[PDB]
């Protein structure tokens, strides 16, 4: 016990002394620089700036990823006409094909519709793909598992079945047929 304790204590004292004499001035300098920079970025205004960035950037990323049409490339923007503030009437003639069926990829494999169902503008909500199924006109939609918290309008709740309408708000995930 005591012999090994004394010898190892002597060796570790020598090792610690060498390590300190070599590395201490730079380790202290690095710690001081880290303290200064972290204190600088954690001042009140930088604190709330970082807060608002973490709060509002994922939505910005999602929205800018939703303005990119794969078939035509680039980004899409429409020329609003402000300045009365604007015209009392508006028109949206048609929506051209932004994507194609062969191009769609899913971030998670739980979001991919099964046979007989197609994706909607709200990910995880799967319609029915038929000829008359355009514009919430085909009843019997389903929802992806783990999609709780998406409150819907009265229009799309009728087509969404009771089980899936519950799953949007309630706990259990539906069993697709």
């Amino acid at each position: 016990e005591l012999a090994n304790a004394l010898q190892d204590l002597n060796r570790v004292l020598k090792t610690t002394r060498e390590f300190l004499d070599r590395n201490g001035g730079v380790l202290t300098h690095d710690i001081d620089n880290l303290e200064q920079v972290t204190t600088a970025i954690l001042q009140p205004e930088p604190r709330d700036g970082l807060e608002t960035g973490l709060h509002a950037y994922p939505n910005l990323a999602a929205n800018v990823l939703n303005i990119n049409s794969p078939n035509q490339g680039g980004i899409i923007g429409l020329p609003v006409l402000p300045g009365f503030n604007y015209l009392p009437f508006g028109m949206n003639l048609a929506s051209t094909a932004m994507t194609l069926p062969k191009q769609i990829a899913y971030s998670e494999k739980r979001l991919q519709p099964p046979p007989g169902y197609k994706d909607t503008t709200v990910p995880g909500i799967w319609s029915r793909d038929t000829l008359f199924s355009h514009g919430n006109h085909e009843p019997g939609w389903i929802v992806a598992p783990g999609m709780q918290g998406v409150q819907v309008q009265p229009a799309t709740a009728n087509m969404l079945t009771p089980e899936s309408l519950a799953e949007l708000l309630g706990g259990p995930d539906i069993v697709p047929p």
């Binding site: 973490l54 929205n63 035509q72 490339g73 009365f84 015209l87």
Partner: protein, 140 residues
Amino acid sequence: ESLPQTLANLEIVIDMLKRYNKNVEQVLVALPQGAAVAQTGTIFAPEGLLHFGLGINAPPPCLTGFLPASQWRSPADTRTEPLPSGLYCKIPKDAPNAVRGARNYPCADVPGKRAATPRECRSDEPYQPLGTNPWYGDPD
């Protein structure tokens, strides 16, 4: 007096990143797809693709909660001015117009709430709109 402050600041940063974990994950998922989108949209070296959508006033712009019309600057003035704070679309959480605006961003710390900034997320004072956006002036 420097190591304890370093550890306290690191604890603050890690706490802020932990409360906003879902936000960080969403940005990390969106970034590679953003790079892929940029690669797709820059196949022509000097020109970047930017299309224009047909249709007039499909969603109208909201001037509520933004700078007044009389405060707009002439396009000739290239001079830079300090950017204003707390400007976003202040419509009363209604209509298809600006549905995904700041006022509907989820609050990470406060479950089941939507607000523009974390300062407004933490505050318990109710969110009241600056005004419905009209077509005939006085957006206030």
